[PDB]
Amino acid sequence: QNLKSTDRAVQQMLDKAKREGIQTVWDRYEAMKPQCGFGETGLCCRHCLQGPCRINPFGDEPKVGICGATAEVIVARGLDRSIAAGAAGHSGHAKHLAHTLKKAVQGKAASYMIKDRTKLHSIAKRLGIPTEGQKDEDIALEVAKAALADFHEKDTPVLWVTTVLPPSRVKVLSAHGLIPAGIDHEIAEIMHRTSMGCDADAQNLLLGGLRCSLADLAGCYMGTDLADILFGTPAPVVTESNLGVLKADAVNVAVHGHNPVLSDIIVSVSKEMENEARAAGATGINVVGICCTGNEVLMRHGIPACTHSVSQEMAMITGALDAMILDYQCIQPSVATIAECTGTTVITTMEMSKITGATHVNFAEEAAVENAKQILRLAIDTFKRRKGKPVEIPNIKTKVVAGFSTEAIINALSKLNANDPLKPLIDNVVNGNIRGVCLFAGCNNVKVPQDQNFTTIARKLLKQNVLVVATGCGAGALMRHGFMDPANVDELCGDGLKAVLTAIGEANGLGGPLPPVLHMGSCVDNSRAVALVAALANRLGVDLDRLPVVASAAEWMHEKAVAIGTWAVTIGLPTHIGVLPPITGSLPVTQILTSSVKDITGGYFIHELDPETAADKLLAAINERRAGLGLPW
Template identity: 50%
Template sequence: MTQTRRHTADPTAHEMLVHARSIGVETAFDRYDKQQPQCGFGSLGLCCRFCWKGPCRVDPFGAGPQKGICGADRHTIAARQVARMMAAGAAGHSEHGRHVLHALDKVADGSLKTFQITDERKLLEVARRMGFTTEGRPVLEIAGDVVAASFEDFSNQHEGKAPNWLKVLLPAKRLERLQKLGVIAPNIDMGVAQLMSRTHIGCDADPLNIILGGIRAAIGDLNGMVLATELSDILFGTPAPVITEADLGVIKPTSVNIALNGHNPIVAEAVCRVAAEMKAQAQALGAVDGINLVGVCCTGNEVMLRHGVPLAANYLSQELVMLTGVMDAMVVDVQCIMPGITAVAENFHTVVVTTHDENKIPGAVHRSVHPENAVEVARGIVELAFDAYKRRNPKQQHLSDEKSTAIVGFSAESIVDVLTRIDAEDPLKPLLDAVTSGAIQGIVLFAGCNTTQVDQDMNYKTMGRELARRNVLVLATGCGAGAFAKDGLMTQEATEQYAGEGLKSVLRALGEAAGLKGPLPLVFHMGSCVDNSRAVTVASALANRLGVDLSDLPVVASAPEAMTEKAVAIGTWSVALGFPTHLGNIPQVTGSDQVVKIMTETAKDAFGGYFIVEPDPVKAAEKLYAAIQERRRGLGLPAGARS
């Protein structure tokens, strides 16, 4: 390891990194070191490559060029850079949703038999919220209505008409505010296309106007996310609490090990189905425990919550699962998949399988998966893992026993189900009572990624503990949820050890109501990064119940290790919904004081939400807690302790 950086706060990942370097295998952490020093212009958002007159850069110290060749200054360049990230993030999440939508469309019209509607209850609830009649109608006919409304969110061309899924998700007050500010596009694709158009050479140069265009795309990102989450629940089942495990110790030498990596659940669902059917074949090869599926990144979170599949790694650790020497196949779909995984796999027997025609990696085996052939192709993928199993080299095995128990599966519906056991007539009342009394001071959603800019998982682990001891209810998604799961914070023991007395009493009461022998876990795992809309669903229910806007609630968000374009889009819509939103690494816009002011001050005036940039995790927790106290004072609620 380098002398100045440990690179990861996960002890198991650290040990595996030491092993990787001892055998000469390069990982993302090594490639990060080789990139040092990184480009200072790019880090400040002052490098522009939007045309071939350049690349251009602006000197942050004033001695060199202050404008690009076309005349764009630091503010225009920085605004264009970050806005285009919002567009790409929205495209990623909405394309995920589009894949699931097309599958549900074929289920609804009877042409797809591979999958079926798993959660009819949720389908009916969604249909009713969209205004469709459900009584006495066939389920598939109702599904067709929901599908049509969802397709409209990709196609409506009429300004002023709010997309259907945003109307389902958001309180009327917030929806009206966003419409007045002109940041709701008629459809998801339009918001992305318009932003790409306005940031083309020779178009929009006003930084505030550019950022507003970015927010418009980011709201489309939220639209695509809620669509993807809700339709996935309808097709594959809505998560409910399940006990599983996390960290590299979930990989078993006595099994055929298959890692499921990426974001789209369609491929993983098919592999889960056929793996159960092919257990005997694995045992016939000598794998006494059959097939062991493990999760990586957000596909891992999807199957973790729906099937209890253990999570081996979050984003930055994805290469490390192969260093165990017993990972037989890694099956990938879309988003956050490192191209470097095939270079690591070449050192072992592991086969990497890509499954989406628009997402291929040199060195991988490609198997084209579509909803119609998903199960058939999944069988072939498992057979590839069998072939790889036969090539295992015992001398390359470097196993870990480290793993943590994780209680996961806290969808909005499962939270309400637990609350219903306390008050069936008014399920939200127990949670509201806890917030208004001060037993729960507020709610924080941890979202986002891992980045090599900070030691992996450290900010999550530190901030989660700091806020929980201040009686803040902790929700998590994506790689942040993976960090908490690996660290043992999704357990009853963590609640007893780290929660403040008020939060602990609430989690004990909810655990008892849920039939557990002890409290609910300290951190609620709500799903993959696309599932951040689950937290918005909870917040919207509270806002509607209290008759206030989202910006009035003691609810905050944090992306302490933000990295992707999707994370930029998520953080942007979080601010637009009215939530104070923390970033733990410095966003690449600081070369423009105007853009910084727009994100922190102008946004607060317009939307009620704003960005808090703080790399120190203890100070960040303090600032989020202060934001919660500001919201509590606004609602006339009693303040909590200062520390």
């Protein structure tokens, strides 16, 4: 099972699933081999009913699509549609939060409120919304209206791009025509230009994709902003991760998906029903997190993280998961079928994301508490049905310190330098104690033994004094393998990095270091990493493509991650990816994305399937940035 996942709890559940005859994502992957090479290389098009068209990577015909579309056009159109689909997910998430904030401040959903007033006021100031002499409710109404206005064309471009990046970066992007005009406007323009008989020039197509990736960045940043207003900005928290966080004697309830608009309410209400859970034979309600909704409630409330991404079915296989409460994105629809065998109640909550065979509860903000109680009572019923059944919860978990929002990181640094908090971090970059910064982001992917790339790359970078930050299922991989436990700083970190983590932690009263990797939150919270490095760029007076900062989507899968990787390149970062997207069928497109885009944005993709080689390539990229600043390396 170690060829399937490097997580020992996951291996144990894979053995249970095998002896019980329950098919897993890994079994369905094996059943798909050999996968289609036209699709793997990108040389397939279904954009009209004259198709499907394909192109042989090498050899004889077919050499061109029926309409005349070349390999370069077919590959670029497919990639653009992936970016648009990712943008549509992150911005659908943000849009829902904008509507929730509007409802809350109009008096229409009393379960929601302005929890972070300081964040509200700073966002308003960032956007140019007046604060002086205005009620908080009116300021928030203005912020929500601004959020919704960024989805369509108006007199200004998308402010959740233009107000969040360094001004020199906005100027470079504007010169290339890359600033989005409206989030949904760009998504639709991608769908139009990639339809049959439309854009047929690879460079033109890819420039559009870069612009649409910035629409995705805007949705990410808007989602983080709005979730912080509504639910609180994260601050450092201590919790646990992996399947051992489930409790045989408790009602185990997983929140799963991405938008925490209901799961934050699930967390609050579950506490109020401890007595009702005790009447039914449980110690209480044990809410646990899967995927990014789990990251949201871990970051804000220290809810323990059960599992992530590719291994999500394994939580059910324990027999102890009484309910799995779904919103949208990254939910394997197999969970609805597996629930019959495991007894778990799978509940969908969003009108646009239903799964056949799952129970649906129509969540509405105005009725959020009622909804959480109806849902949680289905879970309590389920816990009672499994009275006196054996469960197999692997006794495996790690300690996790998390909650490193950008505000929290700046605050931690301020204990070393109150009036210039970024300076101690920059001081240590310049002197070599910190070699650079790497963001790990994105999913797991069944093609890669689970977590193998994240942990192999992270280990090498930490030994070379790289400050490592992580989001999404990259943070999930690292937390499940101990990278967020400060007890592992001695083992994992080079002496320079250890010195800095210790100095910061000791100034924060911890008597011990910050953890080896800083968890910055969910996938939308990749925007927090942008805010951090944008602040660093502005303090140094340079653009992001001169900083020793790189990213690695080491095991990526989702269209959302393709969008994130593309905006990382667009804002100027060397961006490693550990699974090839469907681009190898076009050498011209591959050359743009890995080389010549440098001349446009200063970023570039680094394609490397071997994680040891990937770490060497990321260190090389960091060290070239150091050299361009005149720093030793």
